[PDB]
Design a protein around this ligand. Structure first.
Ligand SMILES: [Cl-]
Ligand SMILES: [Cl-]
Ligand SMILES: [Cl-]
Ligand SMILES: [Cl-]
Ligand SMILES: [Cl-]
Ligand SMILES: [Cl-]
Ligand SMILES: [Cl-]
Ligand SMILES: [Cl-]
Ligand SMILES: [Cl-]
Ligand SMILES: [Cl-]
Ligand SMILES: [Cl-]
Ligand SMILES: [Cl-]
Ligand SMILES: [Cl-]
Ligand SMILES: [Cl-]
Ligand SMILES: [Cl-]
Ligand SMILES: [Cl-]
Ligand SMILES: [Cl-]
Ligand SMILES: [Cl-]
Ligand SMILES: [Cl-]
Ligand SMILES: [Cl-]
Ligand SMILES: [Cl-]
Ligand SMILES: [Cl-]
Ligand SMILES: [Cl-]
Ligand SMILES: [Cl-]
Ligand SMILES: [Cl-]
Ligand SMILES: [Cl-]
Ligand SMILES: [Cl-]
Ligand SMILES: [Cl-]
Ligand SMILES: [Cl-]
Ligand SMILES: [Co+2]
Ligand SMILES: [Co+2]
Ligand SMILES: [Co+2]
Ligand SMILES: [Co+2]
Ligand SMILES: [Co+2]
Ligand SMILES: [Co+2]
Ligand SMILES: [Co+2]
Ligand SMILES: [Co+2]
Ligand SMILES: [Co+2]
Ligand SMILES: [Co+2]
Ligand SMILES: [Co+2]
Ligand SMILES: [Co+2]
Ligand SMILES: [Co+2]
Ligand SMILES: [Co+2]
Ligand SMILES: [Co+2]
Ligand SMILES: [Co+2]
Ligand SMILES: [Co+2]
Ligand SMILES: [Co+2]
Ligand SMILES: [Co+2]
Ligand SMILES: [Co+2]
Ligand SMILES: [Co+2]
Ligand SMILES: [Co+2]
Ligand SMILES: [Co+2]
Ligand SMILES: [Co+2]
Ligand SMILES: [Co+2]
Ligand SMILES: [Co+2]
Ligand SMILES: [Co+2]
Ligand SMILES: [Mg+2]
Ligand SMILES: [Mg+2]
Ligand SMILES: [Mg+2]
Ligand SMILES: [Mg+2]
Ligand SMILES: [Mg+2]
Ligand SMILES: [Mg+2]
Ligand SMILES: [Mg+2]
Ligand SMILES: [Mg+2]
Ligand SMILES: [Mg+2]
Ligand SMILES: [Mg+2]
Ligand SMILES: [Mg+2]
Ligand SMILES: [Mg+2]
Ligand SMILES: [Mg+2]
Ligand SMILES: [Mg+2]
Ligand SMILES: [Mg+2]
Ligand SMILES: [Mg+2]
Ligand SMILES: [Mg+2]
Ligand SMILES: [Mg+2]
Ligand SMILES: [Mg+2]
Ligand SMILES: [Mg+2]
Ligand SMILES: [Mg+2]
Ligand SMILES: [Mg+2]
Lengths: 172, 172, 172, 172
């Protein structure tokens, strides 16, 4: 084993690799949403930029796990980054619903990794997750839920004026 | 077709999507090289950072093609981003050789896209490639070749002192 | 011939003059749109200013072709600048549709001039078009298409509230 | 018991005292390494200073446990600080190997204290360890491992030129 490795279970190492892949996958989904809202026949630029920013943040999340793996003496093992589930995202409401579910999927995986770390008596990995991941998730889930509520209030999907107004006054 | 589309051949649109995928693939390979050189049993931080920076630039290259696609009225279509060809990269020389070949692969694809654009009488796409892609490629290929030459001069792969010196005085 | 003239075909010279005229014509159309949206019974000032700005930019486009003609040793030959096709422009949606078509007409003429320049083996004229004209066109066509999409979303032509909102939040 | 004491087990109090002693012991070992590398017949000043700095940081670690003990209503109990295991440290490689093992010994003791705190249902002590100790350990272990790798690459122990180069380009 690595000269640096201490109290780092093989199962946790492997789980870190899978979580890395899922972060990359989330990043890629967000990128797809950015491109959709930038289409000339969609044209909701502030919504597009919101998703672009989320893509960038997810990539940063992935990078932090790569660094973490190496710090602990694990070995980064990469897999294919699966394309997003859809090629087109409907409208702001449908996209935000999909984003909420993605954020919740990522959060579940983080929580599962925390449980594993707990089971394996790895406080360093627990702290990493708590300090760098779990609160960001909660915040983003809350933000996206709030947006959903507002999009419904504004009459989505049918009310295009409502969708326009959201793009112009919510995505800040 | 899109209301904005003008002089944009379906074949070029599709080729733009494939090129996007290849940029993403290059980005991912570089990320793998970054992680390898950051391993505790490799530990060539400046080399690692060189590759990290190249990964970031490739991702930016990809993003610019997404924007381009939409500007022309094409539609972004994503595919899986294949994992890199190797899980470990040997040493600085082996990695730089692999990088040279990757850069040359990317360059060939750009040149092929330019030929297609020429064939389809698309000067806008030709200009985009010439102005935003082709010269960056040439520069990076030259830089990497120069590095290879220096790594060989320094006695790689066998001369570990040479490898150390490269990390400390070349990657700037 | 002019002492400066070199590799400049008569057909290209003439085509430059026609393109100059078309730029002037586009400028004049935009000016008409500005005046319409400034009418007291239309009163969409930000829309008016958008068109005023486009008129000014088209005039600048024309001026650059005059300079170009002289640089190459051609001779500027002016024709009448035809009045716009309409005296009144309906509403924001109708105007933006007309603008999209005008931009596409101008773009086609630029592309045709590029093909001529290519046929006559004039790389200087090709570069001029690519560097100073073609990308601006693509950008403006995209912007206008995006606007159209939003005006439709907002319920134009029937939804006057939608039209008001566009004037107040899109034309920036 | 102390008026401030709440949820603080006697076993944890005692373990805090032992950990304090071990921090002091680590500090003293590092000081010995500093003095060795400052000898006229060793003369690796940057290496010396690296160890001096680590000694200082370990002393600060100790001080923080004294403060902690008092905050919780425990009582600081001091024991002798044992002299280091060696009087002389060979060379940069041997010293860095000894440092890695010392850091790992300290880390194991921290992890053991965390397990005790967990067993005794003391979240405050768990947080203290996670927030102030465990990540610093991981970082230092990684840094030292990286150094070891580089010293081996440079041909230590036999390659004195390699040792010189390390002192001049790694200890930053
Ligand atoms: Cl372990
Ligand atoms: Cl294990
Ligand atoms: Cl973040
Ligand atoms: Cl699969
Ligand atoms: Cl779909
Ligand atoms: Cl999901
Ligand atoms: Cl967080
Ligand atoms: Cl409003
Ligand atoms: Cl077309
Ligand atoms: Cl086609
Ligand atoms: Cl670049
Ligand atoms: Cl495949
Ligand atoms: Cl491999
Ligand atoms: Cl390749
Ligand atoms: Cl370039
Ligand atoms: Cl001539
Ligand atoms: Cl001629
Ligand atoms: Cl312009
Ligand atoms: Cl006539
Ligand atoms: Cl009319
Ligand atoms: Cl027209
Ligand atoms: Cl341009
Ligand atoms: Cl108590
Ligand atoms: Cl007790
Ligand atoms: Cl510290
Ligand atoms: Cl004793
Ligand atoms: Cl000794
Ligand atoms: Cl020890
Ligand atoms: Cl810490
Ligand atoms: Co923007
Ligand atoms: Co997010
Ligand atoms: Co994430
Ligand atoms: Co980054
Ligand atoms: Co997220
Ligand atoms: Co966030
Ligand atoms: Co760095
Ligand atoms: Co590059
Ligand atoms: Co690239
Ligand atoms: Co970016
Ligand atoms: Co590249
Ligand atoms: Co050309
Ligand atoms: Co570059
Ligand atoms: Co005004
Ligand atoms: Co314009
Ligand atoms: Co023009
Ligand atoms: Co002027
Ligand atoms: Co125009
Ligand atoms: Co413009
Ligand atoms: Co000093
Ligand atoms: Co230390
Ligand atoms: Co300590
Ligand atoms: Co102090
Ligand atoms: Co220490
Ligand atoms: Co905890
Ligand atoms: Co430290
Ligand atoms: Co030097
Ligand atoms: Mg394993
Ligand atoms: Mg997975
Ligand atoms: Mg698939
Ligand atoms: Mg926090
Ligand atoms: Mg909020
Ligand atoms: Mg097609
Ligand atoms: Mg491909
Ligand atoms: Mg495969
Ligand atoms: Mg050019
Ligand atoms: Mg250039
Ligand atoms: Mg150079
Ligand atoms: Mg003539
Ligand atoms: Mg004409
Ligand atoms: Mg007439
Ligand atoms: Mg340009
Ligand atoms: Mg825009
Ligand atoms: Mg007691
Ligand atoms: Mg002890
Ligand atoms: Mg003794
Ligand atoms: Mg914590
Ligand atoms: Mg911390
Ligand atoms: Mg480091």
């Amino acid at each position: 084993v690595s000269q640096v490795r201490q109290n780092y279970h093989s199962d946790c190492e492997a789980a870190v690799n899978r979580m890395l892949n899922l972060e990359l996958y989330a990043s890629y989904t967000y990128s797809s949403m950015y491109a959709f809202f930038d289409r000339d026949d969609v044209a909701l630029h502030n919504v597009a930029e919101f998703f672009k920013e989320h893509s960038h943040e997810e990539r940063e999340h992935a990078e932090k796990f790569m660094k973490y793996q190496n710090k602990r003496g694990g070995r980064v093992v990469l897999q294919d980054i699966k394309k997003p589930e859809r090629d087109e995202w409907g409208n702001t409401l449908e996209a935000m619903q999909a984003a909420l579910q993605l954020e919740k999927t990522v959060n579940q995986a983080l929580l599962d990794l925390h449980k594993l770390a707990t089971d394996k008596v790895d406080p360093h990995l627990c702290d990493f997750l708590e300090s760098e991941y779990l609160e960001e998730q909660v915040k983003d889930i809350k933000r996206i839920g709030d947006f959903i509520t507002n999009l419904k209030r504004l009459g989505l999907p049918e009310n295009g004026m409502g969708e326009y107004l959201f793009d112009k006054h919510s995505v800040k």
